[PDB]
Design a protein around this motif. Structure first.
Motif, PDB file in Angstrom:
ATOM      1  N   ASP A  42      -7.591  22.788 -10.751  1.00 29.74           N
ATOM      2  CA  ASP A  42      -7.976  21.436 -11.125  1.00 29.74           C
ATOM      3  C   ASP A  42      -6.917  20.394 -10.773  1.00 29.74           C
ATOM      4  OD1 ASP A  42      -7.761  19.134 -13.257  1.00 29.74           O
ATOM      5  OD2 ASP A  42      -9.882  19.715 -13.219  1.00 29.74           O
ATOM      6  N   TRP A  70     -10.374   7.670   3.869  1.00 34.11           N
ATOM      7  CA  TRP A  70     -11.485   6.783   4.216  1.00 34.11           C
ATOM      8  C   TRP A  70     -10.996   5.346   4.403  1.00 34.11           C
ATOM      9  CZ3 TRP A  70     -13.099   4.145  -0.700  1.00 34.11           C
ATOM     10  CH2 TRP A  70     -13.710   2.909  -0.427  1.00 34.11           C
ATOM     11  N   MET A  71     -10.269   4.844   3.411  1.00 36.83           N
ATOM     12  CA  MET A  71      -9.762   3.487   3.472  1.00 36.83           C
ATOM     13  C   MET A  71      -8.843   3.269   4.675  1.00 36.83           C
ATOM     14  SD  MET A  71      -9.195   2.731  -0.573  1.00 36.83           S
ATOM     15  CE  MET A  71      -8.613   4.312  -1.261  1.00 36.83           C
ATOM     16  N   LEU A  72      -7.916   4.200   4.896  1.00 38.07           N
ATOM     17  CA  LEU A  72      -6.985   4.086   6.009  1.00 38.07           C
ATOM     18  C   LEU A  72      -7.686   4.197   7.366  1.00 38.07           C
ATOM     19  CD1 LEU A  72      -3.910   3.744   5.239  1.00 38.07           C
ATOM     20  CD2 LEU A  72      -5.395   4.588   3.459  1.00 38.07           C
ATOM     21  N   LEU A 101      -7.145  19.831  -7.196  1.00 41.14           N
ATOM     22  CA  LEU A 101      -8.388  19.105  -6.921  1.00 41.14           C
ATOM     23  C   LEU A 101      -8.183  17.608  -7.108  1.00 41.14           C
ATOM     24  CD1 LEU A 101     -11.508  19.113  -6.399  1.00 41.14           C
ATOM     25  CD2 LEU A 101     -11.790  19.438  -8.847  1.00 41.14           C
ATOM     26  N   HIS A 114      -6.618  16.163  -4.178  1.00 42.51           N
ATOM     27  CA  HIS A 114      -7.582  16.265  -3.093  1.00 42.51           C
ATOM     28  C   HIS A 114      -8.564  15.091  -3.162  1.00 42.51           C
ATOM     29  CE1 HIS A 114     -11.354  17.736  -1.268  1.00 42.51           C
ATOM     30  NE2 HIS A 114     -10.583  18.463  -0.479  1.00 42.51           N
ATOM     31  N   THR A 115      -9.067  14.828  -4.358  1.00 41.58           N
ATOM     32  CA  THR A 115     -10.009  13.746  -4.553  1.00 41.58           C
ATOM     33  C   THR A 115      -9.417  12.394  -4.147  1.00 41.58           C
ATOM     34  OG1 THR A 115      -9.288  13.534  -6.845  1.00 41.58           O
ATOM     35  CG2 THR A 115     -11.110  14.981  -6.400  1.00 41.58           C
ATOM     36  N   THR A 116      -8.156  12.152  -4.505  1.00 42.19           N
ATOM     37  CA  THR A 116      -7.539  10.878  -4.176  1.00 42.19           C
ATOM     38  C   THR A 116      -7.215  10.754  -2.693  1.00 42.19           C
ATOM     39  OG1 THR A 116      -5.265  11.613  -4.636  1.00 42.19           O
ATOM     40  CG2 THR A 116      -6.545  10.736  -6.476  1.00 42.19           C
ATOM     41  N   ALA A 163     -10.804   3.357   7.836  1.00 43.39           N
ATOM     42  CA  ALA A 163     -11.593   2.126   7.882  1.00 43.39           C
ATOM     43  C   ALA A 163     -10.708   1.012   8.440  1.00 43.39           C
ATOM     44  CB  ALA A 163     -12.079   1.748   6.479  1.00 43.39           C
ATOM     45  N   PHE A 164      -9.478   0.936   7.938  1.00 42.51           N
ATOM     46  CA  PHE A 164      -8.497  -0.064   8.375  1.00 42.51           C
ATOM     47  C   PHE A 164      -8.322  -0.048   9.902  1.00 42.51           C
ATOM     48  CE2 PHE A 164      -4.158  -1.495   9.304  1.00 42.51           C
ATOM     49  CZ  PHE A 164      -4.035  -2.626   8.511  1.00 42.51           C
ATOM     50  N   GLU A 217      -8.704  12.088  -0.216  1.00 41.55           N
ATOM     51  CA  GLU A 217      -9.916  11.860   0.547  1.00 41.55           C
ATOM     52  C   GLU A 217     -10.290  10.378   0.462  1.00 41.55           C
ATOM     53  OE1 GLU A 217     -11.910  15.078   2.146  1.00 41.55           O
ATOM     54  OE2 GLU A 217     -12.899  15.283   0.207  1.00 41.55           O
ATOM     55  N   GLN A 218      -9.983   9.747  -0.665  1.00 40.63           N
ATOM     56  CA  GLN A 218     -10.269   8.325  -0.807  1.00 40.63           C
ATOM     57  C   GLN A 218      -9.319   7.571   0.108  1.00 40.63           C
ATOM     58  OE1 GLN A 218     -13.542   8.357  -2.558  1.00 40.63           O
ATOM     59  NE2 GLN A 218     -12.545   6.349  -2.607  1.00 40.63           N
ATOM     60  N   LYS A 249       0.813  -1.206   0.000  1.00 41.62           N
ATOM     61  CA  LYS A 249       0.000   0.000   0.000  1.00 41.62           C
ATOM     62  C   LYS A 249       0.852   1.263   0.000  1.00 41.62           C
ATOM     63  CE  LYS A 249      -4.302  -0.093  -0.583  1.00 41.62           C
ATOM     64  NZ  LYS A 249      -4.528   1.378  -0.613  1.00 41.62           N
ATOM     65  N   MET A 252      -6.721  25.691  -3.501  1.00 41.25           N
ATOM     66  CA  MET A 252      -7.674  25.803  -4.593  1.00 41.25           C
ATOM     67  C   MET A 252      -8.400  27.143  -4.531  1.00 41.25           C
ATOM     68  SD  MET A 252      -9.243  21.978  -5.065  1.00 41.25           S
ATOM     69  CE  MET A 252     -10.382  22.468  -6.393  1.00 41.25           C
ATOM     70  N   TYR A 308       3.713   6.036  -2.465  1.00 43.63           N
ATOM     71  CA  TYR A 308       4.933   6.766  -2.811  1.00 43.63           C
ATOM     72  C   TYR A 308       5.003   6.950  -4.332  1.00 43.63           C
ATOM     73  CZ  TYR A 308       8.559   3.833  -5.150  1.00 43.63           C
ATOM     74  OH  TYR A 308       9.329   3.153  -6.059  1.00 43.63           O
TER      75      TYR A 308
END
Ligand SMILES: [Fe+3]
Ligand SMILES: [Fe+3]
Ligand SMILES: [Fe+3]
Ligand SMILES: [Fe+3]
Ligand SMILES: [Fe+3]
Ligand SMILES: [Fe+3]
Ligand SMILES: [Fe+3]
Ligand SMILES: [Fe+3]
Ligand SMILES: [Fe+3]
Ligand SMILES: [Fe+3]
Ligand SMILES: [Fe+3]
Ligand SMILES: [Fe+3]
Lengths: 146, 146, 146, 146, 146, 146, 146, 146, 146, 146, 146, 146
Positions: E125, E139-141, E128, E131-133, E143-144, E135-136, E42, E112, E47
């Motif tokens: 952009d 959530w996953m981390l 952005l 930023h979008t990635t 959640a872990f 935030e993903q 991961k 931004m 990296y």
């Protein structure tokens, strides 16, 4: 060292990797626990490498005009690796592999001594290539066990 | 037929294909003669299939809650295939394989009977898939011997 | 068995796999815990298979001149699979899937009986193909739960 | 706008795209006429996009700490898209899709307003990406109807 | 906002992502525990993204006639991200990353704002997209960590 | 059923698929009308499958020690499929194919009976595989004709 | 801004990129000097992008129910880009492109204003995507000229 | 024939294919009717070939030390192909293309005469390659119109 | 030599390659002149190799139970490579790299001495692999400077 | 020569290659001897080329507004190639092919005369392309026979 | 050993592999007999390796500031390999290659001595890599001759 | 012209391309100057084509029952191309290649005359294919020299 000494060192590994090919299948099939997916896959990659190694080592022995061991009866009578007992936990399997790889690392070191003293750079290099990977495996597997 | 009967039939093949994996390596390494390149390569493809088969059969036995044989000692005590003697000619190797595949074909036929009578369509189908390929192998190999 | 009996068995699975497609998305999104990455990915592969299955089953029903169920209202009124509650732990999700797959396995077995008694080998084989994979899934998932 | 307002807009689309996934399968299966091959394939590509969209939208809601709708019962109670009646001609299917996509386009426009007023550029952009494609779909589909 | 304001915001991220590139390598190398394989891999993916980001941000600053920070001494004097201490547990590493990504998310939001007020849509952009990635990732981390 | 009965059933299909290979080329070349591109391509895919089938069926007959029909004179004297008249409309071609595939479907059903009663699961399965695809073809082609 | 205003802005670029497609071919063919290989290839990549852009812009105008300019006579009467004179040195070609791209960048900026004031986020984003690349091109090309 | 005669013939085609590149885009964008998807795609493939042709022809003229036409003003003053009127039906577009390709076929025939009489086998062959494809296009397109 | 001596030699290179990764980015971004495209790309390939090297060296140190340097502060305090000043011409950048690579070549030579005297063939080989490539780089780069 | 003369020459080859497609399958299936694997595969490649040729030749006849022969009855009444007797040895098969290819080479030579005298460069070139390959085949096959 | 000694050893192999490249083409073209296909292909693979080797060896000599031999006149005056006589049987060709490879193996062994005594690990390793492959070639080729 | 005349023309090119293969390696290795990367790579592509050409020409001579020249001694005694002197500048190398390619172009023209007058269309076409590429090379290389 003589070419025959090198053929012998190469054959011990042919035997070891055949026994490991089966043992890795054992652990690949019998692993359980929340780390099933990780180990199941990991062990599969390991057995895949074991298979490439058997053919490589054997073909180098042919290259030096030797006879590669080619029977299960001979692998069992020659390998220094204990077969899977198929009863160990995921933890035991990983620790056993660290131990098995570690022992093989020590065999490779000596084996490279023999090839070097026989003036056999190619066989020494082949053995080195496995040594390099097994040392990587041991770190990762030992890391896993924390 | 019971699930246990099917597990047994599956394990005999796990043992057979492990012994064949080694035997195919034997012939792959010891082949000589003007048909070296043909057989050397051919036997390699054959051993590749043998390896896929061992994992498939074993994983189906896990699927049915069984214990797949996972030691060389057990494969030797269970398989019906004789190991390579590493002394035969290219001709002998091909004839031996026709004989080995032929015998395995007969084992698969019975094995499919057992799975069918146990109401096990998936295991029957897996066994069929090998049967279909081995029959192709036998034709080509017998053709080779003229 | 009649062609209509087979169309009915096929439609129950069309409904089941649509409900499973959503449920797998549920677990894919709501999984938490140190096994997040494993399950998140695993469930995604599972939903991918669910999607291929819906189209396959439905197209076989068209092949037999039948009407595949094609509304969410109908899937809910027909499927035997309970929808995700989105509140269960990673453990509960895996156990639920073992249970769901297990039940579907039992439905497939009966479904294959019906197709066979209707002289419908193709539909029987399609159903078998899923049965074979679900049984693999159940072993791995049960192994995970130790 | 609040994050919750955006989560709501995102969930309506999760519901809509699940209903559309099924409806597109409906049209994919029930299309007939000399334009069978064209539409059958076209609708398949459309459902493929619908599936990617459901996961994307839902994962963005997780990203914002929200609960994505994950049951068929909830999609039906939330979506604004009528399910396929599976009785329409090829013409009706295409016109219905132009209508459905058109309505979704209008929903996306409002949805992007909400995300923008909440200072949520990423969600606005995700919604835009679908908007851009649906507008392309509407032109092609309207062109088809001459 | 002026072009210079945007160049400054871009350079802070060039510095941050260089420091993160090293920190991610730190965690990639020092992770231990049964979740070694998961995190090790991961962090490597992370990296990899960090490296693409450094070049993208720097090349956008060149595009606007600016000077991208290009020395380690400057990254250390400019980044707001603390370097790895290489002593933390797997848990600490993941929590630290959630914290680091979270802080970067907050920096991107402001960044931004600046680009927007300077009439710089492209830089806005680009920021952005990260930023979008992130935030993903958060959530996953998160959640872990359950 | 005897092995010879199965060899005969297999040879009728070898003959049929050779005649179909040519007939599909006929329709592929002579199709006209606004659905030229669709059918032209479709028929090409069909002939491609016909070619794979001829080799598969023939090689299974070799596998069972039989003689596969291998002359055009014999295919014409054995096949039950009428050759293309090269004069039919696009509509006629598709209807003819539905009829041809339909008849072949009926031949396959009987052929699978024979293989089954001879205890020949592999040949039965090969025939089934074509049966499954032809039934898919008939649905799509009949759908096309509305 | 109205949809018609946006259609007009989009068409000016359709015209510009058609003229640029030809001009880039001009420079691609007429470049000479020790930097032949570099520019020849570079200009080819540039014309490739020009071609993708013409189709993208035109299809967005169709998406908004507009008429894309589709004649050379109209491109010449509408574009603001001067055609190649095919007489300039490698230096002149690169400088001319920096100038052409720079002017287009300024047109895109205004064009994005218009789309934004018309509430057209998709067209604004499409235009932005080109703007982002052209700015990259200008830096590299200006760098080349030292 | 002289090299200059061949350069002239090559340039007429450079002009023609540039005009066709635009015209094919015209038809690609303006096609409507139930055969939208077919033609839209078909015309795109056609314009793709047109683009490869312009570069090939122009680079052969450079190979013979000639000046390839490289301005839209020159293509319009040289091509014999009428530009799209963007008002024709799908039928008209296809018929127009059959007519355009047919005329180009006649030009290629003469062009190959000139190259041959100038002892220019390579240019003759290049022209032939297009001739061969256009003749294929005309058959398919004429077939489409029934 | 001891394992610790080898760990130290490996860490100096981990530090050097991190500093080089940044410096190569510096030159990749700041290069100007007619050889912009060549160097810009070249330096990118170089930084790509630098990144692979950092992970390889660090993972070998883990393999030998050592601690790889993992902070920018430590790389700066340990590396022998001067950071880019971002002010040099294209010529200066290439000459600097020849100098940097040359110095690293000398470090690798000594480093291989240490690994050899510690009986560490794998680390020696890893270092050799870089040495071999850097020597290739120096020739090409020196050739460039004429 | 007239277009009709060329259509006739093209059709003779359509017939010949259909007969050869079957004959090559004959030899592919009936080959035996230690050179089974070589020939079996070789003949398969040959039949693959035969299939591409039938479609190419037939589509060129459509291109010239002709009717390609499309029935087995017509191929048999038109081809000059004798069908396989399926009784010959591996040697006979290869010699027969040298003879068949050789005769076809002679037919192609005349066929190219006809196309040339009809001013049909494309058909002449198509025929040449096969001629070139068959001559390569004859050398290799004659070499094989020593 | 000095760098010059190593440059000399490297150049002898550059010469040898150029002569072998031609000789392998000789055997590739002149092979006849039932083992034509095997050897023809085999020799092609061999010449492919010969070509990679010439560039590798020469580029290593450039790396060490040496002058690689680059004329046919020099290769002939330097190589120790006799050129093909193009008159030998398939048997003679293979035996000759075993002899040629064997001699080269002996040259490589000495060459590796020289590089080692000059402290040149990279050149030693390059030479080793060929040595390893040639030894594999000799076994297979000797096996072929039975 | 006779077949023997064509064999002779083909052999002169076999000799020329072997000499060029070496000469291109010469320039590939000895190029220096800021255009090192361009030429180094370019010459490599050129030598790659030279190698394909040698095998193609030689195999066509085998196709016509001729003996391809297969010794370096014969290439030197037959080729009209002067070997590299390895002392020329980058400029000299490119000019020399323009000269060499130009001379070969003139040889190909005559060679195509001979093949044509012998009624050998395939050999004429093979020679043409090289002629076409060399003319492309000359333009680009002459362009480079400004
Ligand atoms: Fe092997
Ligand atoms: Fe497995
Ligand atoms: Fe489908
Ligand atoms: Fe997902
Ligand atoms: Fe970059
Ligand atoms: Fe076959
Ligand atoms: Fe388009
Ligand atoms: Fe070009
Ligand atoms: Fe790593
Ligand atoms: Fe076709
Ligand atoms: Fe090179
Ligand atoms: Fe060849």
């Amino acid at each position: 060292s003589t070419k025959t000494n090198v053929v012998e060192v190469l054959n011990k590994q042919v035997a070891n990797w055949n026994v490991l090919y089966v043992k890795l299948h054992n652990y690949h099939w019998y692993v359980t626990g929340p780390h099933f997916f990780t180990l199941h896959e990991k062990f599969e990659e390991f057995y895949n490498e074991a298979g490439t190694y058997i053919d490589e080592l054997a073909e180098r022995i042919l290259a030096l005009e030797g006879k590669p061991l080619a029977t299960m009866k001979e692998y069992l009578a020659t390998s220094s690796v204990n077969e899977g007992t198929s009863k160990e936990s995921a933890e035991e399997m990983v620790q056993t592999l660290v131990n098995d790889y570690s022992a093989l690392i020590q065999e490779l070191k000596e084996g490279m001594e023999v090839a070097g003293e026989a003036g056999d750079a190619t066989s020494a290099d082949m053995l080195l290539a496995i040594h390099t990977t097994l040392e990587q495996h041991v770190w990762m597997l030992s890391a896993f066990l924390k």
